[PDB]
Symmetry: C2
Subunit: 259 residues, 2 copies
């Protein structure tokens, strides 16, 4: 037949709703779209305190990748922390993916430590940017589990600066607690060059991003590695909300290219 | 300068997120807004199974009211089933509410049982209307409990036909199961004229409404009656999504009313 299937994976503190302005566009071109809801996200009834590892969190995406047909490929699109999630999926079903796209996200590799990207980012970014963000523990002195919950100020100054007030009000009303999973990712080599490294990587840089500045974005493109690099000028962190059309046109071009 | 407090109350299968377009607009007019989420709605962790009565469902709204100070009145705005929820806040705290606004909502009376409008609604509209909506029981034969959950078809044809594709995409990914709570409301009369009935009532009619057809809306005004019947012609059931400005304008007209 004709068309393509896109798998959208939101980032921390978000959900599938996040792709509500992009989904109609991709579909308007005749493609399949899945704005999945990772664990403890959107409407998923699982509590964040139930996720002990990055895997528990990526369970839904994983189960989806497992339900793909023999000749049913897909285009992965990870946003923010969604880049990490893609990793797990890429390692497990490399050939079931046409190409992985990292829209202003944390794109790992199969050379450095799994939490390398999230470590460098932290070190560069001062603990002041987080503003009113809540980091609450929910584990044990021996099995520490930290939670992350974006505050309203950090949402209106670092992620939604160039977004509409309607969009900020929506997010404020849906954002839930999540995590970055350090103790886990820092103690494991989840990705291998034979699997994770077999999937072509595409990165979409957001110039006006304040959560993950274009600086750290470009950095990953120069140190981690990419197959192609596309940028969206004028967009902040939530480029799917402030620049849907431009994003959709980018996602279509990627599709036409990589098979 | 004086400023009103709008307490918006979402309808069934929805959440406080449905007011994302109206919220900012009422705020720019220097008004404080709260788009609260009811139990088992939006991001609440409770499940529709732990709910048996309309009160268990309205708990969040009741917890908001009781917190309000005497000198801190508010203007309640209910949508669709959100109307019944206003019922409970009214009967309980009628002196802390300036006015109760029914936006294409089921507005209950203080005469018959609490399930009246709801029972007269099901009889005035055939079964084909619900389309692919689901009515599943999670109770027992001697203790019946039904759950309601609009399907994609009923949503895009009966609730979002005049709305954009974006809005339709948003809902599909947020809509959660709800309930009309017939069992609880048919076995009691939670409203009275002394308390409930002494609250100024305003009704906003949405003409292109398919779920609650403009007909039944008018009928609720003819049976239950009001103090001010406003109209937003051209608007579907999701007025805060396809008609945020006119809705906003209407609400700012009720403030001084």
């Amino acid at each position: 037949k004709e068309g393509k299937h896109f798998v959208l994976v939101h980032g921390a503190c978000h959900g599938g709703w996040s792709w509500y302005k992009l989904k109609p566009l991709l579909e308007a071109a005749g493609h399949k779209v899945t704005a999945l809801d990772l664990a403890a996200s959107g409407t998923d009834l699982r509590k964040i305190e139930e996720l002990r590892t990055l895997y528990d969190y990526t369970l839904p995406l994983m189960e989806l990748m497992e339900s793909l047909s023999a000749d049913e490929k897909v285009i992965l699109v990870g946003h923010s922390l969604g880049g990490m999630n893609l990793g797990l999926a890429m390692e497990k079903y490399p050939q079931k993916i046409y190409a992985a796209v990292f829209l202003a996200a944390f794109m790992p590799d199969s050379v450095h430590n799994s939490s390398f990207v999230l470590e460098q980012y932290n070190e560069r970014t001062p603990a002041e940017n987080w503003l009113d963000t809540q980091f609450l523990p929910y584990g044990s002195p021996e099995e520490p589990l930290t939670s992350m919950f974006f505050g309203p100020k950090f949402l209106a100054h670092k992620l939604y600066q160039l977004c509409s007030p309607e969009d900020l009000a929506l997010a404020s009303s849906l954002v839930r607690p999540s995590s970055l999973f350090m103790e886990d990712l820092s103690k494991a080599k989840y990705f291998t060059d034979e699997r994770f490294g077999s999937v072509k990587r595409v990165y979409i840089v957001c110039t006006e991003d304040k959560g993950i500045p274009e600086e750290f974005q470009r950095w990953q493109i120069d140190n981690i590695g990419v197959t192609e690099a596309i940028e969206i000028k004028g967009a902040d962190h939530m480029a799917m909300l402030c620049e849907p059309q431009k994003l959709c046109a980018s996602l279509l071009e990627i599709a036409h290219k990589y098979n």
